[PDB]
Amino acid sequence: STGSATTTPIDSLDDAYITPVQIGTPAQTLNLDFDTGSSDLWVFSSETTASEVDGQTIYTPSKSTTAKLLSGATWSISYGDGSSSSGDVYTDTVSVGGLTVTGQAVESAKKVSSSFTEDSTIDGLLGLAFSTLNTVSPTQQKTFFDNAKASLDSPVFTADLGYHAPGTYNFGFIDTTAYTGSITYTAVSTKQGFWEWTSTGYAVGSGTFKSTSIDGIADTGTTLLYLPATVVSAYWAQVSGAKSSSSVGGYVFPCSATLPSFTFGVGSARIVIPGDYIDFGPISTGSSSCFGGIQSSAGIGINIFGDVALKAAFVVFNGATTPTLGFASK
């Protein structure tokens, strides 16, 4: 089997992307944030504290003939950005772009933090990291991909995120029309539960590529590109007027500036992020100061190839017995 679904930015800055997911019988369609950096599929629901719901579409398990309560099970997650959610657990039929998994754990939120409430466009998350990170207790549950894997024509999914435009998540096949040139594959470590890999280096604008190992994670659920302070400083030094602002929380630059591209290495291959992808707009409405899309990972504890990086590529998440990641230009 295969599946293919369109993913759409939630706003004009590509802060996140939402993909429609069918849950239950009859289907309830919710727009979920596919997150290769976590491993829980959780939704706003009829059980979510009413005061914490503000415009989201909710899952109502009592209206699904296929919903089953996982007796006594709970879940609770905290994300890198400080947000969180928790609740109880159902299994139900879940379909993405024509691909159906029966008995998928659908984690129903009883509580969500303010950042989720405040985002009316995101009805939940669909985790696509390794199932070892799943937070269900007492018994961990498998991700949608892990459950679908054996049935897929090939044990892969691909992310093809758009810049200020829709893109595509495919399951079970590689669309050879969706990229230019060849896909370069690189090794993955699953030791921390992430799609963790080692970039071979970077370049700033037209500068000569610097060969240096950068361990990090491919994370569709993170907006920006978070890299070591050395790398990030080298980038912003090439932008007139750019500076790191503790007040704002990162590198800012004059909105009128021309941003250089940023290149990262995948083996001997190279992915070029156009300068415009690194512009995240005015720091506040009406400001002439803009927020940068490449920021330091110092104090995160891990480098993160988030949407800023991934949307410059066609990305293969190869869930074979020994997982790998593939990147192509597009």
Side-chain angles (χ1 to χ4, degrees), residues 244-252 291:
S244 184
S245 168
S246 57
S247 170
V248 175
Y251 282 93
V252 300
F291 195 69

Side-chain angles (χ1 to χ4, degrees), residues 43-62 64-67 69-109 112-141 143-148 150-190 192-242 244-291:
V43 297
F44 279 80
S45 75
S46 55
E47 299 174 338
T48 309
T49 301
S51 68
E52 295 178 352
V53 183
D54 188 5
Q56 295 82 10
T57 295
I58 64 171
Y59 169 58
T60 301
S62 69
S64 174
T65 61
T66 41
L69 181 68
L70 189 61
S71 190
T74 58
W75 63 279
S76 179
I77 195 164
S78 297
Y79 296 102
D81 69 346
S83 65
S84 64
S85 51
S86 62
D88 49 27
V89 187
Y90 292 84
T91 59
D92 211 336
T93 302
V94 173
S95 302
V96 177
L99 169 66
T100 300
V101 171
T102 56
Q104 172 63 47
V106 175
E107 299 171 36
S108 171
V112 304
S113 66
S114 66
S115 63
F116 289 115
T117 299
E118 286 160 0
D119 188 354
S120 66
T121 71
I122 292 174
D123 300 324
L125 266 67
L126 190 150
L128 290 169
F130 292 87
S131 293
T132 52
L133 294 179
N134 179 264
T135 78
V136 176
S137 177
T139 300
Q140 289 182 284
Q141 302 297 301
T143 70
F144 176 81
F145 178 52
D146 211 346
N147 282 322
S151 302
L152 294 178
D153 290 0
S154 184
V156 306
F157 68 90
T158 65
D160 180 7
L161 301 180
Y163 169 64
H164 294 355
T168 305
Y169 282 102
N170 290 332
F171 291 82
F173 73 105
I174 304 304
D175 178 359
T176 60
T177 74
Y179 56 87
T180 60
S182 70
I183 307 178
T184 292
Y185 289 87
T186 195
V188 163
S189 173
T190 63
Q192 296 189 85
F194 301 120
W195 293 93
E196 189 172 2
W197 65 291
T198 301
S199 174
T200 49
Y202 70 98
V204 175
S206 62
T208 63
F209 181 94
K210 172 79 171 178
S211 171
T212 185
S213 293
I214 304 168
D215 290 347
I217 66 166
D219 188 359
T220 59
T222 292
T223 311
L224 306 187
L225 173 53
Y226 295 91
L227 290 175
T230 46
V231 177
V232 176
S233 181
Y235 176 82
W236 290 107
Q238 297 306 311
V239 179
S240 294
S244 184
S245 168
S246 57
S247 170
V248 175
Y251 282 93
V252 300
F253 66 94
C255 292
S256 61
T258 294
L259 295 177
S261 63
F262 183 89
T263 301
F264 63 94
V266 183
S268 52
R270 306 287 179 256
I271 300 293
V272 180
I273 304 169
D276 296 345
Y277 289 26
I278 298 159
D279 181 3
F280 277 76
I283 60 170
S284 287
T285 305
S287 184
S288 68
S289 180
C290 273
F291 195 69

